């Protein structure tokens, strides 16, 4: 029952997550969702009156590109600087003993600020703001083994990608910044590129007294 409590700089959820509209990638209530977005916008503006939504998306793509370059060169300090504590471990622990070759080629269309949401005051005296941004870019990816053998992707071939990246800033923090919190992938998303190796999924392991049922 010590008076020192854990001082978190982020949350681990999305406040009213943007549900993906069907056919957004296939094609090359609005007033209510808009009005909620700008209610959250005047909350960010009140906590910091120097924020521009029209100026966000270039900073968002900058944060994304530099975070993935820090992922390329294993710069965990700058990755902490640009990436929230909820997004860091599911960024790094699947690549902890692997080599990742990532690059940014171009953007097909400019990124779009598509959702803005805010927290309540009660969150331990802290108020957080999240902004969801559509990105649709062309990237390259080549993840290597512990031994240097190739596992995923191709070295030179670029491919299209569409993500719903959600950034979060702690507004009450005097030194808070906009960092990547997560990314929504749609449930209707196209299936990912197949892996380069073969996988055996085992069946049930049967005790002697048990009989296999189909």
């Amino acid at each position: 029952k010590s008076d020192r409590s854990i001082h978190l700089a982020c949350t681990a959820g999305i406040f009213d997550a943007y549900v993906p509209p069907e056919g957004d990638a296939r094609i090359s209530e609005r007033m209510k969702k808009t009005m909620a977005s700008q209610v959250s916008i005047r909350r960010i503006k009140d906590y910091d009156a120097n924020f521009k939504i029209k100026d966000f998306p270039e900073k968002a793509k900058d944060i994304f590109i530099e975070a993935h370059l820090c992922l390329n060169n294993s710069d965990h300090d700058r990755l902490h600087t640009l990436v929230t504590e909820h997004c860091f471990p599911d960024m790094t622990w699947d690549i902890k003993y692997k080599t990742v070759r990532w690059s940014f080629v171009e953007s097909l269309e400019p990124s779009h600020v598509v959702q803005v949401r805010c927290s309540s005051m009660m969150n331990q005296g802290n108020v957080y703001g999240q902004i969801t941004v559509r990105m649709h870019t062309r990237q390259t990816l080549a993840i290597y083994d512990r031994f240097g053998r190739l596992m995923y992707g191709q070295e030179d071939v670029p491919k299209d990608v569409l993500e719903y990246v959600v950034f979060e800033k702690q507004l009450t923090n005097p030194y808070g910044s906009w960092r990547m919190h997560t990314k929504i992938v749609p449930p209707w998303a196209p299936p990912k590129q197949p892996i380069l190796k073969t996988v055996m999924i085992p069946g049930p392991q049967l005790k002697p007294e048990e009989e296999y049922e189909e």
Binding site: Y97, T99, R101, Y144, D145, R146, F147, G148, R149, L150, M151, K197, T198, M200
Partner: protein, 166 residues
């Protein structure tokens, strides 16, 4: 103490050029502080040196030793970490490169003898070290042939020089 076997298991390599051999996978595993003698554990390791993973599992399953059971568990979980984390394709595509027993940290107990005499028991412990390499097991070295013996003798005879002169 030292845990360089685990650090060997977590060493990492640079990416591979597309015009060189595949550099087959290497998996390091060990069990520490096994209540068993390192000599008998050496006998079991020397039994399973150089075999395939399935062959080693068969021999350890049908051996009659507590160390055989322990090494079978170690090999099973080493194969599990092999095709779970080190990107080994087939779970049967492994062989034992290194199989070693080491001395553990033992304890001293008193052994009461006759008269007023005593001895010092050792509660002996041991480690087991294993290394798994992806690939078929390497072929055993063939025995030397009479042709090879004759060639070696003739090489010695032709390598003879006149000693202690110009």
């Amino acid at each position: 103490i030292s845990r360089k076997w685990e650090k060997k298991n977590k060493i990492v390599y640079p990416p591979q050029l597309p015009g060189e051999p595949r550099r087959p996978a290497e998996i390091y595993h060990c069990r520490r502080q096994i209540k068993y003698s390192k000599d008998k554990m050496w006998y079991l390791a020397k039994l399973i040196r150089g075999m395939s993973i399935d062959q080693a599992l068969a021999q350890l399953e049908f051996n009659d030793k507590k160390g055989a059971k322990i090494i079978k568990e170690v090999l099973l979980e080493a194969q599990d970490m092999a095709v779970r984390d080190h990107n080994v394709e087939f779970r049967s595509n492994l062989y034992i490169a290194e199989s070693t027993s080491g001395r553990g940290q033992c304890l001293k107990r008193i052994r009461y003898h006759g008269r007023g005499r005593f001895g010092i028991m050792e509660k002996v412990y041991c480690h087991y070290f294993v290394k798994l390499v992806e690939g078929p097991p390497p072929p055993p070295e063939p025995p030397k042939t009479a042709v090879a013996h004759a060639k070696e003798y003739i090489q010695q005879l032709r390598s003879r020089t006149i000693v202690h002169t110009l």
